[PDB]
Amino acid sequence: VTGNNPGAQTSESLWWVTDAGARFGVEDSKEARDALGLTLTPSLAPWVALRLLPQGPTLSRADALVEHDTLPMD
Amino acid sequence: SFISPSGQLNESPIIADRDSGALYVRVGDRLYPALNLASARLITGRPDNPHLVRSSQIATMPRGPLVGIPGAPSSFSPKSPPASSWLVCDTVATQGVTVTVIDGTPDLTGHRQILSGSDAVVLRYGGDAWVIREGRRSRIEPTNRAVLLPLGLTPEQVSQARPMSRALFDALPVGPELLVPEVPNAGGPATFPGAPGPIGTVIVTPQISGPQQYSLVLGDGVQTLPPLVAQILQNAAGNTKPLTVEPSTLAKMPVVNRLDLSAYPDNPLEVVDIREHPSTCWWWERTAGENRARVRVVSGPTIPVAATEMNKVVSLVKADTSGRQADQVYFGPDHANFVAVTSESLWWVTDAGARFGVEDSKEARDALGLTLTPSLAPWVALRLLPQGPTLSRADALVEHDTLPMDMTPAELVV
Amino acid sequence: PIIADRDSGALYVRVGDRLYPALNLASARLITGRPDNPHLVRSSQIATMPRGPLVGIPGAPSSFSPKSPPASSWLVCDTVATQGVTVTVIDGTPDLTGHRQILSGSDAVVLRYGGDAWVIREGRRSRIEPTNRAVLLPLGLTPEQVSQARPMSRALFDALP
Amino acid sequence: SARNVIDQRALGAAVHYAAVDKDAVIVAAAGDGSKKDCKQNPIFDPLQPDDPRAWNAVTTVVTPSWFHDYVLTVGAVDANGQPLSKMSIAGPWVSISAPGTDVVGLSPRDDGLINAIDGPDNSLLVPAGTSFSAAIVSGVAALVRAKFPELSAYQIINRLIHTARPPARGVDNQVGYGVVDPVAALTWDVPKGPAEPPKQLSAPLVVPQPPA
Amino acid sequence: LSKMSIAGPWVSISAPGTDVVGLSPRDDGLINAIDGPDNSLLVPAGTSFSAAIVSGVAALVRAKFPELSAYQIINRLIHTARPP
Amino acid sequence: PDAFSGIAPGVEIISIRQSSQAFGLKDPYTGDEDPQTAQKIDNVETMARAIVHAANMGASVINISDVMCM
Amino acid sequence: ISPPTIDPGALPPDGPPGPLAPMKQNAYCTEVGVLPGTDFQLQPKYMEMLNLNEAWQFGRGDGVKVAVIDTGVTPHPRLPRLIPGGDYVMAGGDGLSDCDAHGTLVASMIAAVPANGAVPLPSVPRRPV
């Protein structure tokens, strides 16, 4: 993600976009980047356009290490 | 083709990416990513397995949002044995109890034994002690010396018994309490002629061979009593000795069968020492076509599972803090996956120990397979497993862009 | 550490000495810590190892193939019908063939939002009012023409500077 | 410290009076880890989704920043956009962030610009931290209130929050809702009501008609 | 605890010195740590607690063998320790 | 409700206060000897007195958990 | 820890600023300077993010009063609209002298006026430290 003006130079957060059209946030820790296989340079995008895609759950190692008996349908 | 396997798009509607195992389903001219095999089968209506296709092919077709039921089963292997066996068992700590459910034939080798005949065990629940024998439970009281003394129990031995799980308490059916049998209208006059005494008096007659025969006067006659039962009446204040009578007059007297003695045993109880047998199980057994299932009780030093397979017991999360759910599940040899219960209801049990309800209609019984006849199982055991959503065709025809998050997970430890 | 049933297609992950069924590939990679792909294993062998409850993140992505094209191109599009609009997001190079054209020079377009009329030209939006005959006439507009302009989507209103 | 917290009733009443009865907007710094008693607070725990801001784990309390219902707390980021994980206190009250490095300003005791202040020794020390990031947000809030004089304090805060660029978790105790964005705050059509979650996420699948 | 105890030639025996617990001064309950110079909550550990454990064991031993002199009680503790 | 307990709940303990960091001398001048070494000689002398006193009280076990490094 | 609760009956009484007990100065005010090699003709790097050259088109914020509660501010020819609000540390202060060299940076970073060929107020009546 980067600013919308034509002269912006920042880079504030990393996102993954699936071909089904949903964005998932990626925690930029060295362990998360290497486990997913995202040790690569990201392409820039404008927030005014990217915000229009629906947001899913965050991807992180500490987040996936959980057990569930059954999952709540709703 | 053998050197570098791959695949081609075909008529089959369930396909999977050979490079990543992602599962897709086609509807119309569009591919939809599916959450699991169960919903993919249920949406298309064909009981089948995914067809492998190369990634470069799947990328050309148009997509759509996610479809299916979240968390549904992901593998199907119908299995139905001729004999069905289930056990609800627990184990006591060296405070606290742990409940384990078993599907399949138990192992009775080693010091394990059936709790039949004169053997019995005492447990505590709800503030009352309970005596378990011959497949039933009965209540007892620590103050009633008249019953404890001839039965062989002791006040210390009754008040110090270990706790019992609520799961086992419901599974075991109740029997009449171990109390002094009351006689209606005791001391009243007998209705039959030649009565040796008033109602509630005990009569005894000798024999040329064998032990003396005891009997009790009732409003309508006399009922024969076993020796151990007679001692309970004799032990309580009362008459010093029973009425001795001639065999011939007693033979002519009207015999009655009105009071029930089902709770009293034949000899003093052989109380099983809970330190040596910290585990007791309830066993339900039935053979296809039999009129009724057989109920038995087992006890031993450890759960009735083989020492070799003791390591592959499944441990559940058990988010429910109430007693209505089990802690562990084990699938022994010749277990049953597809089950029906006593108007009947159909259930599918997964290897992970979850149960899912299946519709009775041809739609579900065709799309998912499961067309064979299910095996029978008892509701008192099956209800102990955690429940998932029902596999109806109306439920799988849903789209999602984000799934709801579970509010009570548990930690995975490496 | 990541294996899949060769017949059932189910996905499993290994931790310690147990096999756990995983919800998706994204969570299987994070748990194992390796950027691998599922290995195909004979179903008869999977049945011999001890199970565990479900693990992972529900609905996470199921396939990873990073990409980095030479240039990044994004579009936010608004299309009106005949009242009502739809918003479309395009990622990649747009197709300019045919009757389509790039707005430049004297070309302009008028749209409505919150009742006000906005003139789009030179890559920006500028407000105008229907009462001011002195400004409308020299520019070539007409009060009727401004009043009849069609709606504008919030997606495009926030995007145009 | 979270232990032996001091009675702040007097401060609580003063904040409510200024924010509600006088419609003032209050901007406060999140605090710098270099201060004598400030210690780093713990962040979100995926194992206990009971409270997304993790209030039960707080160990250091920062006041008046604590009154998250009436005060806007600013965290710090470097000039490139990365959070200054080493000096912001990252509590559950943090709501927004702004730059906090390469500080420049007019000089007291002189008549020109300055860039550093003398330390306790020969060392010449450069200033940095949240105390400057709070000043930046205070400037943007002044411009916005000058353009939308009809809006109340509670509405101006929602205009800044909803226009900021978010972090990978959507809301994070390290930076709050995101990085401030002046041009967006002054021109976007932000909805006037507070945030609300959707009614339901599912929709029925329109299956095609089977062939005869 | 190689990093915290002075290894002199007089050292004769050893005992635990971590995970200390005890009654609380100025209160009526238990405690585990003390406020340091800063607001930091410092946890106590060290030989001053190990000397307490041995003081308790010595009291029990010369309750059972009241006939032994001081020098003999020390030899009874030393000879039964598990050696390095 | 609480698992803690002493090693010998039956003993009787005598308390003597011989050292503390919260107290100081209210005439800091100490003359010829450096104020830091002057304090150690005061501790050695006071320590000997406490041991003799505790012995005459009849204690059979004396515990010293405060020692001086030199 | 639980979210704070408020009781509006406890409002403190209004009155002129003043310390709660008499206080005296204990240390000399800190010195300030410039780092080797800096050039104030280049814009500060933090201004690249704010895009002020586009945001000022709607006006520079005329007519808004901002209160700075801190170590106070020292007057400067670049701050033409500074107002004294009072002092709580010293009983006789106006709250217009930055001994800690902190309030002047925070304040000047918000309202300092850009450079011009001549200053609006050439006077300099400020007292010594």
Residue numbers in the entry:
A (entry chain B4): 423 to 496
B (entry chain B1): 74 to 167, 175 to 316, 319 to 424, 433 to 504
C (entry chain B4): 86 to 167, 175 to 253
D (entry chain P3): 336 to 547
E (entry chain P1): 419 to 502
F (entry chain P1): 266 to 335
G (entry chain P3): 40 to 168
Anything the authors wrote about it?
Specialized protein transport systems—known as type VII secretion systems (T7SSs)—are central to the virulence of this pathogen, and are also crucial for nutrient and metabolite transport across the mycobacterial cell envelope. Mycobacterium tuberculosis encodes five homologous, but functionally distinct, T7SSs that are designated ESX-1 to ESX-5. These systems translocate a number of effector proteins across the unique and impermeable diderm cell envelope. Here we reconstituted the ESX-5 T7SS of M. tuberculosis H37Rv in M. smegmatis to obtain a structural view of the entire T7SS membrane complex from this human pathogen.
Within an EccB5 dimer, two slightly different conformations (that is, inner and outer) can be distinguished between monomers, depending on their position. EccB5 dimerization is mediated mainly through the R1 and R4 repeat domains and is further stabilized by the EccB5 C termini, which wrap around their interacting EccB5 partner to form intermolecular hydrophobic contacts with its R1 domain. To form the triangle-shaped assembly, the inner EccB5 engages the outer EccB5 of the adjacent dimer by packing its R3 domain against the α-helices α5 and α8 of domains R2 and R3, respectively, which results in an asymmetric EccB5–tip arrangement. Interactions between EccB5 and MycP5 are mediated mainly by the MycP5 protease domain and a composite interface that is generated by the R4 domain and loop 6 (residues Thr424 to Ser435) of the inner EccB5. The MycP5–EccB5 interface covers a surface area of about 1,230 Å2, which leads to the burial of three conserved tryptophan residues (Trp437 and Trp469 of EccB5, and Trp523 of MycP5). MycP5–MycP5 interactions are mediated mainly through loop 1 and the N-terminal extension (which run across the top of the MycP5 protomers), and loop 3, which contacts the neighbouring protease domain from the side. The active sites of the MycP5 proteases face towards the central lumen of the cavity, which implies that potential substrates of this protease are translocated through—and processed within—this periplasmic chamber.
